[PDB]
């Protein structure tokens, strides 16, 4: 722990938890949001026999544990799970006590207000944090980009959000949430791999196939033409070496998996591709600034490490929108940490401690005070 009473910066992103100290450039403890529990009961002795398993421990013990998600698309299952994982993060991973450091947290866009009130109340009772602040990840990604104008595409693991912000002002009237995310990607890839001869249901193979998505997946420039040329495609077809050692070969599926977000009709969504969701979002607001939105679009999330989103994005928007002004996307490398960086940025300036949510305000007005203290 630093000698100074600097604040805690924790991004509880929908899919990854990244925690550390204020003034740091990158979060120190970063772990996926999976939680493992003992698949069977206790009869043995001498070691183990522990209920909750979180972090890399559960990653190593994936096979023996039922792998469960305490949060999915924002919905909260069991607050005890968050209690334990935050205990682990603060003491076993961050080696910090929350008594002496206020916490800045980031929440998924348009999270329930009742969810905020319950989570804040359990937090304040269970923990002894001196002060509090929670913010939407959209403005955090904006801060990471450091440009007040643009539309943020937050692609988490449970929801994809499109949020327009012009000159550092939120536009909730033109903000939308789409239920397509990593979960859907894994599902669709699971069914295609089932049609390829490999049919698995458990979560270990879920992580294997999301790793495959991280490594080999394409974003098709032209879809049906690329499957037409991918009929044989000995060179274009790509293989992976699974940890057991078998060589699993995939061809068109590499660019037929992310395409589903662009083409939701593959597995039955009324909503069109996410580019349509950015398009409608843009026109909902006044006409004039729309061009700037076209030229200032930002994309954020862990998924963004994949190739192909930028070219597809610009080409389709230019197809939909007039091609007079040039559209260009901006995306700094390793932007999944960017939100946490913005949290540090929030703690950088000396005005931030004017609106810390202190203990006594919550003791006076209950959780309801946040309704007036954040917004």
């Amino acid at each position: 722990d630093e000698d100074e009473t600097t604040a805690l910066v924790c991004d509880n992103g929908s899919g990854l938890v990244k925690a550390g100290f204020a003034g740091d450039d990158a979060p120190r403890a970063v772990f996926p949001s999976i939680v493992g529990r003992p698949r069977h009961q206790g009869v043995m002795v001498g070691m183990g026999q522990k209920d909750s398993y979180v972090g890399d421990e559960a990653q190593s013990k994936r096979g023996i544990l039922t792998l469960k998600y305490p949060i999915e698309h924002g919905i909260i299952t069991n607050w005890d799970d968050m209690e334990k994982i935050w205990h682990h993060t603060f003491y076993n991973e961050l080696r910090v006590a929350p008594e002496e450091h206020p916490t800045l947290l980031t929440e998924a866009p348009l999270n329930p207000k009742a969810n905020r009130e319950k989570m804040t109340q359990i937090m304040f009772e269970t923990f002894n944090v001196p002060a509090m602040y929670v913010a939407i990840q959209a403005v955090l990604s904006l801060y990471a980009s450091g440009r007040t104008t643009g539309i943020v595409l937050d692609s988490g693991d449970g929801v994809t959000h499109n949020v327009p912000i012009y000159e550092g002002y939120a536009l909730p009237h033109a903000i939308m949430r789409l239920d397509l995310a990593g979960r859907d990607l894994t599902d669709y890839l699971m069914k295609i791999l089932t049609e390829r001869g490999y049919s698995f249901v458990t979560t270990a193979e879920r992580e294997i196939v999301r790793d495959i998505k991280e490594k080999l997946c394409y974003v098709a420039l032209d879809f049906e033409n690329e499957m037409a040329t991918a009929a044989s495609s000995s060179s274009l077809e790509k293989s992976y070496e699974l940890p057991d050692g078998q060589v699993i070969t995939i061809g068109n599926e590499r660019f037929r998996c992310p395409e589903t977000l662009f083409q939701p009709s593959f597995i039955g969504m009324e909503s069109a591709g996410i580019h349509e969701t950015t398009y409608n979002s843009i026109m909902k607001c006044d006409i004039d600034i729309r061009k700037d939105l076209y030229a200032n679009n930002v994309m954020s999330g862990g998924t963004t490490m994949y190739p192909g989103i930028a070219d597809r994005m610009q080409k389709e928007i230019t197809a939909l929108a007039p091609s007079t002004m040039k559209i260009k996307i901006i995306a700094p490398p390793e932007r999944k940490y960017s939100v946490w960086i913005g949290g540090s940025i929030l703690a950088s300036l000396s005005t931030f401690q004017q609106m810390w949510i202190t203990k006594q305000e919550y003791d006076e007005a209950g959780p309801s005070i946040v309704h007036r203290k954040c917004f």
């Binding site: 722990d1 076993n92 080696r95 009772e125 003791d363």
Partner: protein, 74 residues
């Protein structure tokens, strides 16, 4: 839940620990002897507050010890 328990447990503990003075009736000599006694009590409280702070630092050190013993364990 536990909202009142924690707060009024703490206030109860600070009530049994501290002593309440009927100051209004206290006589001149009584203000003398008592403000001396109260200042001495604050003196001792700060003394073993400093002791608590130091020993807090060392218990942090042994936390450091044990957590490192844990991380080496893998």
């Amino acid at each position: 839940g536990k909202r009142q328990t924690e707060r009024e447990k703490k206030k109860k503990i600070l009530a049994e620990r501290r002593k309440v003075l009927a100051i209004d009736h206290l006589n001149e000599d009584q203000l003398r002897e008592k403000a001396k006694e109260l200042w001495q009590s604050i003196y001792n409280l700060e003394a073993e507050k400093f002791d608590l702070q130091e020993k807090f630092k060392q218990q942090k050190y042994e936390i450091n010890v044990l957590r490192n013993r844990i991380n080496d364990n893998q």
